Design a protein around this ligand. Sequence first.
Ligand SMILES: [Mg+2]
Ligand SMILES: [Mg+2]
Length: 338
Amino acid sequence: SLDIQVVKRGILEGHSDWVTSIVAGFSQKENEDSPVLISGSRDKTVMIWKLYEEEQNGYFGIPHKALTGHNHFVSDLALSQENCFAISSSWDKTLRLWDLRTGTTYKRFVGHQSEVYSVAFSPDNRQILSAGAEREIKLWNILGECKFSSAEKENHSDWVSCVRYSPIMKSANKVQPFAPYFASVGWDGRLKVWNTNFQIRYTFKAHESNVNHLSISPNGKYIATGGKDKKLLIWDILNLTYPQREFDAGSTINQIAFNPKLQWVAVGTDQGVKIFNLMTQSKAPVCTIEAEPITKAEGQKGKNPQCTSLAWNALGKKLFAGFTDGVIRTFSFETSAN
RNA sequence: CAGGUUGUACUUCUUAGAGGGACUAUUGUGCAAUAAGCCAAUGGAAGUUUAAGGCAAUAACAGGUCUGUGAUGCCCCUAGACGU
Ligand SMILES: [Mg+2]
Ligand SMILES: [Mg+2]
């Protein structure tokens, strides 16, 4: 057997409610570690984390700055390439541009109506993409001006849950055969793929229930898609009649993340976090349910927390799961190969 | 520590418009024949129907009001008038 076992790293706490979004630093000079962690939660707060080198006590790190601009929950965060800037989606019908050194909000994006579930940052950093319960995807100048809004003929029924982008690698030698696209996942169970011009390129009806999250392989060759359908769908951008691969992950799918290198898929689920190996065909490579540190409070027992977010650090060695109890948990992997 | 001034300044305090927010939320081998519900702890600005009120069905009670009304039936007073 190839055993992939998990060493517990630590605990990042001080998030009052849920942990809805997590981003880790971009690798700046190549193959070097990311010092930076940012989370977003219900709690009305965006947390900036100063991370311990080793692990002291049971903790992996300590809260540095708490960004407060927001009325309702923070749905999703995205980083600039600079790593010096972050953005916040919210149910408060607004987006925010955050300087990461100062607590300062730079500009805020206004003009969304209902509420905002997700945001994406384009590789050029001059385009912001935002989506919400308006069944609408919006394109913003970094100066805070709505540039475009996808219309009825294209846009999908119910709510856009998540929008993301299609990475173009640095070297041209990294083999980019396709066109640039952006992907939109929704509560109608539709995975959409649009060109830069906001023209529908490929819209497949992926799921039977609703889709909470979508992420793109670092290669931009495949898409991972998931929600209440209790199914993890992987799609080849070459042949779409049939989904590339499918996995059964217990109960409901909250989040999905690709290992920036390692070629695994981590899935946030109510039961816990599952990790899939794409290099072999088997259905459950590493499974983590987490008992509650808040349960250690005497007399109150948990049903377990459910994990509301995932992120990998740039090196792909560390993994962060945001939870129901407002605690981020950190885990590392040791390989024992028989 | 106090005044006086000031600005392509600002919203914590102050107005008060928009919109949030609480649904008994979360947890509970707590009581419930596990159903309505109650209870506790935690979080929470707020968990006594959040608090205090407005409105008030069917029916009555020959309740009160001709002295609130230029709403009136009938009765009475009409030039030393019960009129002004
Ligand atoms: Mg009342
Ligand atoms: Mg009488």
